[PDB]
Coordinates of C-alpha atoms in Angstrom, one line a residue:
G7 CA 86.9 40.2 -37.8
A8 CA 84.3 37.8 -36.4
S9 CA 84.6 34.8 -38.5
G10 CA 81.4 32.9 -36.8
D11 CA 81.1 31.4 -33.3
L12 CA 83.3 33.4 -31.5
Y13 CA 82.1 36.7 -31.2
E14 CA 83.7 39.4 -29.1
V15 CA 84.4 38.2 -25.5
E16 CA 84.0 40.7 -23.0
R17 CA 85.1 37.9 -20.6
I18 CA 84.1 34.7 -18.5
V19 CA 81.5 35.2 -16.5
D20 CA 81.5 31.9 -14.8
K21 CA 81.7 28.0 -15.5
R22 CA 79.4 25.3 -15.2
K23 CA 78.8 21.1 -15.7
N24 CA 76.6 19.8 -18.6
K25 CA 73.6 17.6 -18.1
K26 CA 76.0 15.3 -19.8
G27 CA 79.0 15.9 -17.2
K28 CA 81.1 18.2 -19.2
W29 CA 83.2 21.3 -18.9
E30 CA 80.8 24.6 -20.2
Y31 CA 82.2 28.2 -19.1
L32 CA 79.7 30.5 -19.0
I33 CA 81.1 33.4 -21.2
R34 CA 79.6 37.1 -21.8
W35 CA 80.4 39.3 -25.0
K36 CA 80.9 42.8 -25.9
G37 CA 77.6 44.8 -25.9
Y38 CA 75.3 42.5 -23.9
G39 CA 77.4 41.6 -21.4
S40 CA 75.2 40.4 -17.7
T41 CA 72.4 39.5 -20.1
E42 CA 74.6 37.7 -22.7
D43 CA 76.0 35.2 -20.4
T44 CA 76.3 32.1 -23.1
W45 CA 77.8 28.5 -22.0
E46 CA 81.0 27.9 -24.4
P47 CA 82.4 24.4 -24.5
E48 CA 86.0 24.6 -22.6
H49 CA 87.7 23.3 -25.7
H50 CA 86.5 25.9 -27.9
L51 CA 85.8 28.9 -25.5
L52 CA 89.4 30.7 -26.4
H53 CA 92.6 30.3 -27.7
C54 CA 93.8 32.1 -24.8
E55 CA 94.1 30.3 -20.9
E56 CA 94.3 33.6 -19.4
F57 CA 90.7 34.5 -19.8
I58 CA 89.8 31.0 -17.9
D59 CA 92.6 32.2 -15.0
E60 CA 90.2 35.8 -15.1
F61 CA 87.6 33.7 -14.0
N62 CA 89.9 32.0 -11.0
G63 CA 90.8 35.4 -10.3
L64 CA 86.8 37.6 -10.2
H65 CA 85.0 34.4 -8.7
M66 CA 87.7 34.8 -5.8
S67 CA 88.5 31.0 -6.1
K68 CA 91.3 29.7 -4.3
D69 CA 92.5 26.6 -6.6
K70 CA 95.9 24.8 -6.7

């Protein structure tokens, strides 16, 4: 199952910039969800870009 770092993602919460100006996506993992909201790097968050698209949908974001 969960081999290490990438626990069972419920969904993407949100995204932000790092103090070094890097893309971190606030991801929640199931079981804690709301109080889980943890900042995972873009290039390690998920093997599926569908989750990133889900963020753009749930935040109601006109981006093209």
